[PDB]
Amino acid sequence: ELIKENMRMKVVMEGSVNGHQFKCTGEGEGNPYMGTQTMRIKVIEGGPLPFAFDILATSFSRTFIKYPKGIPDFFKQSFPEGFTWERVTRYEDGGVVTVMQDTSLEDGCLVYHVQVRGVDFPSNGPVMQKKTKGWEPSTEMMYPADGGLRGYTHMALKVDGGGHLSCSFVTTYRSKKTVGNIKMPGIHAVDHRLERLEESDNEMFVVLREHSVAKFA
Ligand SMILES: [Mg+2]
Ligand SMILES: [Mg+2]
Ligand SMILES: [Mg+2]
User: Fold this and answer.
1) Contact 121, 131 (CB under 8 A)
2) Which ligand is nearest the CA of 182, by number?
3) Could you tell me what this protein does?
4) Rg, C-alpha atoms of the chain
5) Which of 81, 106, 180, 193 could form a disulfide with 176 if both were Cys (CB 3.0 to 4.6 A apart)?
């Protein structure tokens, strides 16, 4: 079918955080049925970023979730047309990030277009001071919502000196399927582990790896 055991992805991300304009490109691959993927990301405009790359990392891939056959896979069913996602992220101490994403399939490659707008991060907070240490593993609750899905995640951004910055994601996943059917899942959870590795000194190059597995709520 269209989502093969090996799939490539490409991403273009444009946005701003606290007025700082940037652009990133990414490419990678994974095993959509095993829920594993890796991607290589470059900051191509606005680099070096004067904020933590961690606030972008969660915007770089829902086709690579391991769904058990008993839980319908909204994302893989949405091809060939694909799906969109819209997110609002609220950070402890201020920091609101709004994200709009398109997922398409072009010549057998997944193609992502992402728009990111971050505002009101404190000037001497760990995001704008680049004192973050990556994301804890998290569980995203998935709910049926008017023929799409609502995702809800409480994430913990690790900070220098042992603390965390609490943050909350509400995501709306919408199908772009204009011909054909989608079997809607019930309430479920997705367990995520997002790792950054192979980073350059000023985060102009970052490798992300993700493990995403669906389970019953
Ligand atoms: Mg399915
Ligand atoms: Mg902060
Ligand atoms: Mg660098």
Assistant:
1) no
2) 1
3) Pigment protein.
4) 17
5) 81
What is the Å distance from ligand 2's center to 24 Cα? 22
Residues with Cβ within 8 Å of residue 66, at least 6 apart in sequence: 33, 34, 35, 212, 213, 214
Distances (CA, A) of 151 to 47, 48, 84, 127: 31, 31, 13, 24
Candidates 211, 78, 210; CA nearest to 149 is 78
Method used experimentally: X-ray
Tokens matching residue 101: 């994403």
The alpha carbon of 82 and the centre of ligand 2 are apart by a number of angstroms equal to 34
Q: Is the dihedral of CA 64, 31, 192, 182 positive or negative?
A: positive
Judged by its nearest atom, the ligand closest to the C-alpha of residue 203 is 3
What's the half-sphere exposure (Cβ side, CA atoms, 13 Å) at 12? 4
158/184 Cα distance (integer angstroms): 35
CA distances from 38 to 100, 182, 201, 213 (A): 21, 27, 20, 15
CA of 205 to the centre of ligand 3 (A): 6
DSSP reduced 3-state for 76: helix
Ligand nearest to the CA of 73: 1
Residues with CB under 5 A from ligand 3 (ion): 200-202, 204
